[PDB]
Amino acid sequence: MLGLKTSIIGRRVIYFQEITSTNEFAKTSYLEEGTVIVADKQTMGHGRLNRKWESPEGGLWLSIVLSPKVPQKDLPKIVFLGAVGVVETLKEFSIDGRIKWPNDVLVNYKGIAGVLVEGKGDKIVLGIGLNVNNKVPNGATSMKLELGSEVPLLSVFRSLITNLDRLYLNFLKNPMDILNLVRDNMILGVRVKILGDGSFEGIAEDIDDFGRLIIRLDSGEVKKVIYGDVSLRFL
């Protein structure tokens, strides 16, 4: 009854009034490629770095099951697919979102969406958490706060699924393309600090052909940061 016209993503959609986490369900269940798992709220949701994710009623919490048969050297790039999809959808609602490497989406430096990609055996689970009408934590934002008005949650879903499907079909044929879209929508040319072990600061110059963040330290040294399991702070 939803009348989705997508080719792969959204061929099937499993909706839950409440769930522990859409990513966990997608990982532990056999689902055909393109299946979207979505819930009004999550009781154990989280984003990258295991950051607890308040997923209250009003937001868009979903996961997509994918099994892209692309060269493995290109597989690591699906994380960006979600971020770019969110940016395209936000633009449709007159909101200018920018990507905070690797896959967070910000609006005026305030978090509005997060992407969590996990791999289980043969498939990849692309999780997205987008603040729409739900109340957000201090420092974060939402579509409702940005537009100062209620936003039809289903309208956002339709838009996002449509964009993700389009991006995914092209990724299957031209996997290098997504990096260019990421680059064109990412926050660059500003100072950042990579936290944790061997912490350092520098200018985030660009992302390379592998999606690594290229940082220029004050000394002139150039470091390439892997998208995995690191935290980044804007200075």
Add this chain to the structure above:
Amino acid sequence: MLGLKTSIIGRRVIYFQEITSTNEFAKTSYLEEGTVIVADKQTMGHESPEGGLWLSIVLSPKVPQKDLPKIVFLGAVGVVETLKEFSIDGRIKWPNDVLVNYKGIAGVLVEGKIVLGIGLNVNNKVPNGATSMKLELGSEVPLLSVFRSLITNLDRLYLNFLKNPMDILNLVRDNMILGVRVKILGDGSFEGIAEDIDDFGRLIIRLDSGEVKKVIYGDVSLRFL
């Protein structure tokens, strides 16, 4: 994202762009009670084109074995209530069909774990002699609005049915086509006036001879004369 607030029916909803049959998927798959299977179209329903509301609901009612036959009435009444919400006069053709001015607009199929299947013509093209919500109202009807309405009605009806399986019969009686001649097809056939449904949901027919027959659904077909 749908924000359904029902208690059981609609706790989960599995949507398909296309499926062979929502009833077959529901019967075969491992699903929890209240899960609704809905598709834009069914390729092998019993086809169901885009524009209609095609769904099945998984139920596990812990009620007396004798009350299971009443489940079909939950679907028929739920459809009638939703149609009334859209100002369409749907009437029940005992025991699983809904007509508008004697034209078919919906059908209910219960199998079984009990699977309650419902097919409702909304914006889809229909067979000769049938009708749809769009044809009755004269304009397209938001399919999702019909789904929300129906799911809400079915959830309320089901929750009460679990406690009082008899209550549904009164709602059927108030919304069913009665007082007219019908032909019952089974082992041969007989005709008579459809008088009412009894405390078991059996159709009571008065033959011209004065004989009274009680019809149980399962191996029979009813036709209006």
